[PDB]
Amino acid sequence: MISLIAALAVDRVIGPWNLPADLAWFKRNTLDKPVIMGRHTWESIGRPLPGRKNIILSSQPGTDDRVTWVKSVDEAIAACGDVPEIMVIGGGRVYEQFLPKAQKLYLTHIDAEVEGDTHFPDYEPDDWESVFSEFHDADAQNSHSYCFEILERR
Numbered sequence: 001m002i003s004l005i006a007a008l009a010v011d012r013v014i015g016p017w018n019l020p021a022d023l024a025w026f027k028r029n030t031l032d033k034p035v036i037m038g039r040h041t042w043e044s045i046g047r048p049l050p051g052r053k054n055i056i057l058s059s060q061p062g063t064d065d066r067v068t069w070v071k072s073v074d075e076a077i078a079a080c081g082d083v084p085e086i087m088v089i090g091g092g093r094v095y096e097q098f099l100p101k102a103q104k105l106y107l108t109h110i111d112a113e114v115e116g117d118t119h120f121p122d123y124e125p126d127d128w129e130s131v132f133s134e135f136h137d138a139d140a141q142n143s144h145s146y147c148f149e150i151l152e153r154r
């Protein structure tokens with residue numbers, strides 16, 4: 001099953017905030033699963049995320065034997081093997097091209113106004129069912145209130 005995970009400020013902007021809570025949610029959901037990423041998230045991460053196979057969806061070749069470089073969506077998939085779930089962690093372009101094959105979304109809705117270049121693709125309500133939502137306040141550690149939600153494609 002293909003699943004997307006993303007943190008969204010208002011307007012579903014993905015790109016400011018300091019959310020340790022969002023990061024332990026991200027970790028708990030991708031640990032021990034393949035994670036499909038875009039070349040820029042790669043360069044911004046800079047090294048393999050531990051505990052996951054890293055597969056990079058890029059047009060030019062890789063320069064890193066530590067991960068899997070894939071030229072397309074179907075090769076992404078194929079590179080993953082026989083696992084119950086594949087996590088799409090981002091790009092905007094990546095999320096856009098995987099949406100149509102996704103069955104689950106894991107979103108962090110951060111109450112925060114921002115001016116960014118990228119958006120999460122628009123998913124359609126009559127298409128997903130919200131099976132989970134959990135609301136949190138800003139705190140000693142997390143600068144903004146946030147909510148965790150999971151949607152399954154109905």
Ligand SMILES: [Cl-]
Pocket residue numbers: none
């Ligand atoms: Cl760990």
Ligand SMILES: [Cl-]
Pocket residue numbers: 008107108109147149
């Ligand atoms: Cl949300």
Ligand SMILES: [Cl-]
Pocket residue numbers: 109133147149
């Ligand atoms: Cl919500």
